[PDB]
Amino acid sequence: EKKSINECDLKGKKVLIRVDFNVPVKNGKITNDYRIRSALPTLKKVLTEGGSCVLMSHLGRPKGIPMAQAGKIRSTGGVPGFQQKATLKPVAKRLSELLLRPVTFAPDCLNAADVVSKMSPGDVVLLENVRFYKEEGSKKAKDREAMAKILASYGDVYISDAFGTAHRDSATMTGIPKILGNGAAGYLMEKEISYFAKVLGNPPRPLVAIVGGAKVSDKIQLLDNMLQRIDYLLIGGAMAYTFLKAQGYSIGKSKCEESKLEFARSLLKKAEDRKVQVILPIDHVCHTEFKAVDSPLITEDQNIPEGHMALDIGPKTIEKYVQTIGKCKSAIWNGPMGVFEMVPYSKGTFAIAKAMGRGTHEHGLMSIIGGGDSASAAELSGEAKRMSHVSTGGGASLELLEGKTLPGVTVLDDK
Ligand SMILES: Nc1ncnc2c1ncn2[C@@H]1O[C@H](COP(=O)(O)OP(=O)(O)O)[C@@H](O)[C@H]1O
Numbered sequence: 001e002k003k004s005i006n007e008c009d010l011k012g013k014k015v016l017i018r019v020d021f022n023v024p025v026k027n028g029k030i031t032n033d034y035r036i037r038s039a040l041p042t043l044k045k046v047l048t049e050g051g052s053c054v055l056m057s058h059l060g061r062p063k064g065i066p067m068a069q070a071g072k073i074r075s076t077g078g079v080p081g082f083q084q085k086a087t088l089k090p091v092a093k094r095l096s097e098l099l100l101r102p103v104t105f106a107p108d109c110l111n112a113a114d115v116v117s118k119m120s121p122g123d124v125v126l127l128e129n130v131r132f133y134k135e136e137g138s139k140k141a142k143d144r145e146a147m148a149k150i151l152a153s154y155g156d157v158y159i160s161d162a163f164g165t166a167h168r169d170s171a172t173m174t175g176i177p178k179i180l181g182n183g184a185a186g187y188l189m190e191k192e193i194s195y196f197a198k199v200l201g202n203p204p205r206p207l208v209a210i211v212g213g214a215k216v217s218d219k220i221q222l223l224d225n226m227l228q229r230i231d232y233l234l235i236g237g238a239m240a241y242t243f244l245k246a247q248g249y250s251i252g253k254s255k256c257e258e259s260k261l262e263f264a265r266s267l268l269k270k271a272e273d274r275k276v277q278v279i280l281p282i283d284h285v286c287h288t289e290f291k292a293v294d295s296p297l298i299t300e301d302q303n304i305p306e307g308h309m310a311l312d313i314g315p316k317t318i319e320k321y322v323q324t325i326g327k328c329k330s331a332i333w334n335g336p337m338g339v340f341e342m343v344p345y346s347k348g349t350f351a352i353a354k355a356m357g358r359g360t361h362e363h364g365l366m367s368i369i370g371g372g373d374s375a376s377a378a379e380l381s382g383e384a385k386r387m388s389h390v391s392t393g394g395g396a397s398l399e400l401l402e403g404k405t406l407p408g409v410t411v412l413d414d415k
């Protein structure tokens, strides 16, 4: 098992903490800071122990820029790879408010030596989005290490509290502990890993995996490796359209991974072979445009009219999904069933949340909800508190089904 912050000497040390501050943002504002709130304990620990924090995280999926191209930008005085919608700035502000102390925001994670050097115990520094640099997520270890070398020069001890990006073998996740030669798990990492651990071992079956949301291309690839664990696979959100089209239905202008259709088909084959009852939308809630509208189009078929885009699962689908969740003893959910941010497209998401919250509360249904947007929905409904666990990890919570040890976790000093 991995070493904890508890085992580290933090007094007077600059702790490099990789957190998951990839919170939901709209118009440059955080709409849900559950991922930040969840990281509070580890930061409190280091502050209480007399250390200082230099936090690293990513927001969104910015294009990134090669480190080489950065130098030129910095000469101009700009920020390498900067994308306004993916700044961690609002996160720095929020964190400062929760922590009740200043959080200095270093606008460039690879050019923060100055600020870092001036740190003293009690100080908290948040570096700009590490994903502003392509090397952070490069597949080329050489590349990751290049960037990690710099970041690693920022502190003494490293601790990872970013369960949520633990499935991401990245520069900040695995590269820094590698180059620094140490790494422990924060409290949140420990917590998530433990709850999942205890739960994924002896899950009360039937076990239904409800997966929705977006990020289809990546998320769809996690499904194959979770068929062995699950009994039911409910599919909603954008994820559904690729499956439905692969099956031969009309998808209209709905989100679809056209390059995954055969993959979808094969996965459905394996699902049958692995004794997994996969269920897709029966009907949909649609509209001609990605805009809310009181009373949008609700289909009868799995087919979506050419001019429409399905934005939520339909009533018949909500019924079957809720019904099957009722047939289970374990439920793992990731991804809203529709565009829950808009009232007319929120019924599916809140229905699943309700069923899970109710199942747990009235029958011990062991429920786990994961993901930033998912956590927001759970909180909006109020069912968050009624779940067995609401994880800060979405894809992380899904990858974890495969049984493999998350690289971010793995890289940690298992002591
Ligand atoms: N039918 C849909 N069409 C387009 N987007 C959708 C649809 N259903 C859900 N989404 C979007 O996908 C996002 C949530 O998915 P995802 O980001 O993968 O979730 P999480 O952060 O919980 O893991 C939301 O912004 C949601 O509106």
Ligand SMILES: [Mg+2]
Binding pocket: 372, 373
């Ligand atoms: Mg998201």
